[model samples]
Target: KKKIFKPEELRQALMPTLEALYRQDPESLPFRQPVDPQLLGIPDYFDIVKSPMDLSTIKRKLDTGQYQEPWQYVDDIWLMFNNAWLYNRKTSRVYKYCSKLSEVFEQEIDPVMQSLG
Candidate 1:
């Protein structure tokens, strides 16, 4: 079976998770922005400045079937929206400038979700 998730729904799905990530690394925020991803490799800090745990979760979500609606239960890449521009990582920059997390779903990921359904 396939699932569909609207932006509001998806945001709701990730609320606790956002809170959780902040719990894990709130202190890192101020320090991370003006630094390079290579300067301090604090646990999957590259690409997105996530804790190793957070990075793994995002990796898992992306690696799964698109039809599985990975973002619904797992971490959406946009969880690091600020980190993208803040961290100055090229990869992260693409996501930050590209679209909002919800917008990506509606404009990009959501279209794929419909196909899966």
Candidate 2:
């Protein structure tokens, strides 16, 4: 005789394995991270936006394994936002900085993705 399995039973059997996969590699999950809106840098933006003071808070949470899920979500957002910010800032700064060093500098800086504009 052949074995038979119900849909619910199959799902129940796979749930644990799926959960383990999620635990091992959360980046494969299908959710986006939260964004810190204040990180956007417009002219005179520094005065209006407060500096991030949650570094210690995040470190403590991660150290204690508290709110790990929420932290992961926030981390994704922070990563995307900072990546964009740094890329643009670094590219422009490098171009500007190099322009002063070389009299014949003629390269145009490339724009990075996820820019606010």
Candidate 3:
């Protein structure tokens, strides 16, 4: 059995689930783009969130073949969701989005990754 995925094959397999995450109602909006502290006026963002991760950033990496393993993709997704959790209070909408999107990622990626494994 093929245990390793070619870059193009990996990209193809990941795109569908990634696209689905982007389509989720409103919850996906904040993640679709990178955090723009300047535009959003959060000056202390980078100092707080050391490793910034976003869906579009992952998409670009996937497009450019930067991901060699499935776990690399998963790690970035976790960082993205976790970044939201760290930056926002539990009662905030952003944190709620993190909860929702995290579940969605787990549910969707479960089968996608299992099939690959």
Candidate 4:
């Protein structure tokens, strides 16, 4: 319950800090990691976990062992949110992230969650 944060709350918290980062230190971006699909492994690199999406396998991935540090997922969101903070296009960079993120969410995110449900 304590961890529950509404979308408005998150945006309120994240926007100011990101704006500050943008204004003060522009270099702190997701560029640290190459953001290359081949290295990251995605649609083209190879398979996306071929093991059956059975309950036990899923449980193993996020069971008690995984549950102990659930906050890491939240932190991951925080980081990814700021990672590709801005981008327009190859030539038009600087457009702020999220469209790409939403694209990824469109392709794969909800499918897995829906699968589990």
Candidate 5:
């Protein structure tokens, strides 16, 4: 079906963009894998971020072909950064990382999405 075709097409379009965000820069380091709240000494992190997201988790989803739509991927990315913004101080380095990644992601993802439409 045409619907089935779209999912595979979207997946192919997004995988490289996902890698570019995580592998191309230092700002994405902390987000590339799941955060260890206990190891980072922020034990309350889980308390605040009830549903966490990470690049690794998204990558797994992509590898498993679980995404049905482009926004499914976008939602995971948003969840990953919004959690950081919610937990870290605005003046902190982690918050800055979130801002930087979010900005770059938005810029990088725009044309890809527009092209799909």
Candidate 6:
């Protein structure tokens, strides 16, 4: 019988599966570059309300079904937050920020949670 995986283990397994899927269908994974946080015109350290509201707007469009290409926006946001988490390890605040940002995509994207043998 196959063993069932916990949520975290399934998440870990998804990385390689996603990489393989990306290799097979490059068009499915579109964002090649990360968006510069500076270019977003947001203030230092994201504020839920006081700082620049690009993320908020993105979330709004996502919620309201206003975007013509929702997948592209999702990919861009994923790349941006993933890059930020990878490159800015010095800031604890970024960790929390990235976690929150990731939740949005994960919930919206319906990420497949599978286990490996």
What's each prediction's TM-score?
Answer: 0.30, 0.23, 0.94, 0.27, 0.90, 0.35
Error of 6 at 94 (Å): 1.1
TM-score of model 3 relative to the true fold?
0.94
Alpha-carbon shift of residue 33 in model 1 (angstroms): 5.8
Per-residue lDDT of candidate 4, residues 8-80 (tens digit): 4434333332333333233334332334555544343123222212123223333333332334333443344
lDDT of each: 0.42, 0.33, 0.90, 0.35, 0.85, 0.44
Off by over 4 Å in 6: 1-68, 111-117
Output the better candidate (3/5) by lDDT.
3
Write one digit per residue (lDDT tens) for candidate 1, span 22-114. 343333243223334466554445655553223344434434433145444434445444454444455653444423333433444444444
Q: How many residue pairs clash in each candidate?
A: 0, 0, 0, 3, 0, 0
Question: Per-residue lDDT tens digits of candidate 5, residues 30-60?
Answer: 8988999988999999889998998999999
Top candidate when judged by lDDT against the true structure:
3
Candidate 1, superposed: residue stretches over 4 Å from native: 25-35, 38-68, 71-117
Residue pairs with backbone atoms closer than 3 Å in model 1 (clashes): none
* Tens-digit lDDT string for candidate 2 (3-70): 44343443333233223322423231211222245453444533433333223343344445443233
Which of the two, 2 or 3, has more lDDT?
Answer: 3
TM-score-based ranking? 3, 5, 6, 1, 4, 2
| Cα deviation of 110, candidate 6, in Å | 2.5
User: Which one wins on TM-score?
Assistant: 3
Which pairs clash inside model 6?
none
